[PDB]
Curated annotation (Swiss-Prot):
This is E3 ubiquitin-protein ligase TRIM31. Auto-ubiquitinated (in vitro). Changing C23A: Abolished E3 ubiquitin-protein ligase activity and ability to ubiquitinate NLRP3. Belongs to the TRIM/RBCC family. A zinc finger (RING-type) spans 23-64. It comes from the Eukaryota. It comes from Homo sapiens. May form oligomers. Interacts with isoform p52shc of SHC1. Transmembrane segments: none annotated. The chain holds residues 1 to 66 of 425 of the full protein. It is found in: Cytoplasm; Mitochondrion. E3 ubiquitin-protein ligase that acts as a regulator of antiviral immune response and inflammation by mediating ubiquitination of substrates. Acts as a regulator of innate immune defense against viruses by mediating 'Lys-63'-linked ubiquitination of MAVS, promoting MAVS polymerization and formation of three-stranded helical filaments on mitochondria. Acts as a negative regulator of the NLRP3 inflammasome by catalyzing 'Lys-48'-linked ubiquitination of NLRP3, leading to its degradation. Regulator of Src-induced anchorage independent cell growth.
């Protein structure tokens, strides 16, 4: 029996303007913005996670609008 490891770094920070829409739920770069009937845009990681017990229809969190997943079958 024997082993060992060691490592250290610093890296560099970048100063740029990120004009990429963000999810108002998780607050993460919205990679896949889904504009539901209500309009608001959410991230798959969210819209999906939120749907645990429900079948598919879920009243938008931001606005209480009767929305029901519907699209070209
Ligand atoms: Zn999200
Ligand atoms: Zn909404």
């Amino acid at each position: 029996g024997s082993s060992g490891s060691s490592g250290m770094a610093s890296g560099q920070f970048v100063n740029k303007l990120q004009e990429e829409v963000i999810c108002p739920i998780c607050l993460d770069i919205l990679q896949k913005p889904v504009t539901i009937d209500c309009g608001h845009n959410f991230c798959l990681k969210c819209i999906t996670q939120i749907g645990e017990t429900s079948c598919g229809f879920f009243k938008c969190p931001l606005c209480k609008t009767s929305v029901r997943k519907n699209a070209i079958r």
